[PDB]
Design an enzyme around this catalytic site. Structure first.
Site, PDB file in Angstrom:
ATOM      1  CB  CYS A 196       2.500   0.870   7.564  1.00 50.42           C
ATOM      2  SG  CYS A 196       0.827   0.511   8.186  1.00 50.42           S
ATOM      3  CD  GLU A 248      -0.532  -4.486   1.772  1.00 52.91           C
ATOM      4  OE1 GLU A 248      -1.238  -4.986   0.856  1.00 52.91           O
ATOM      5  OE2 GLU A 248      -0.275  -3.268   1.837  1.00 52.91           O
ATOM      6  N   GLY A 299       1.590   5.564  11.092  1.00 53.05           N
ATOM      7  CA  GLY A 299       3.022   5.842  11.297  1.00 53.05           C
ATOM      8  C   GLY A 299       3.859   4.584  11.494  1.00 53.05           C
ATOM      9  CG  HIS A 355      -0.447   0.097   2.504  1.00 57.12           C
ATOM     10  ND1 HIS A 355      -0.335  -1.010   3.325  1.00 57.12           N
ATOM     11  CD2 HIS A 355      -0.086   1.171   3.249  1.00 57.12           C
ATOM     12  CE1 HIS A 355       0.122  -0.626   4.503  1.00 57.12           C
ATOM     13  NE2 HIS A 355       0.309   0.697   4.466  1.00 57.12           N
TER      14      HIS A 355
END
Length: 182
Positions: A148, A72, A146, A41
């Protein structure tokens, strides 16, 4: 404060950079040579900022399992003039549960941040922001925006990168040795 934090600090000091995309600032784990990982992402493009320096992306691959389900994890090869310390021997070979893990973050917002998250479950399937996702690790800590890309470690193992949370639980994508065979 103890041997968990010691291993986590060693990984942060040598194997992390601050990555900036159009979607934000992320902790980014360097794995070997010029190869790093970041949550998918982050939407890595042709150019990324590494420690506030404009860097060409030589390759970027958003990983999916053999059922064609999101993992991911994006693997990025950076046009950088320096290699990472090779930490592939700290990556687990198989999906597993863990005790006594640390989540470590290093960004402009959260410098030198370490969180003892405790027990890590092999959760498996997660609907992550609407996207069916596999190989998710779960820990019972109220992680926030904050974090990730934050690195999840135990003593002697680098097991995942933080990809989201629901306010009570935090979620990481597994790192596996087989992702980084060259």
């Amino acid at each position: 404060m103890g041997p968990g934090f010691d291993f986590a600090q060693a990984i942060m000091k040598k194997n992390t950079v601050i990555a900036r995309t159009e979607k934000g600032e992320f902790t980014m784990l360097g794995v070997y040579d010029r190869v790093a990982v970041i949550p998918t992402h982050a939407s890595v493009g042709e150019i990324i900022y590494i420690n506030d320096v404009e860097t060409r992306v030589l390759d970027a691959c958003a990983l999916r399992d053999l059922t064609d389900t999101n993992l991911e994890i994006t693997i990025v090869k950076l046009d950088r003039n320096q290699k990472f310390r090779d930490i592939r021997h700290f990556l687990p070979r198989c999906e597993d549960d863990y005790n006594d893990a640390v989540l470590s973050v290093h960004t402009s917002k959260f410098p030198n941040m370490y969180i003892p998250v405790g027990q890590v479950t092999n959760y498996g399937f997660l609907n992550l922001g609407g996207t069916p996702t596999h190989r998710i690790l779960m820990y019972n800590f109220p992680t926030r925006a904050g974090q990730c890309g934050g690195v999840v470690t135990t003593t002697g193992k680098v097991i995942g990168i933080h990809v989201g949370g629901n306010g009570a639980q935090g979620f990481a994508a597994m790192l596996l040795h087989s992702y980084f065979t060259d």
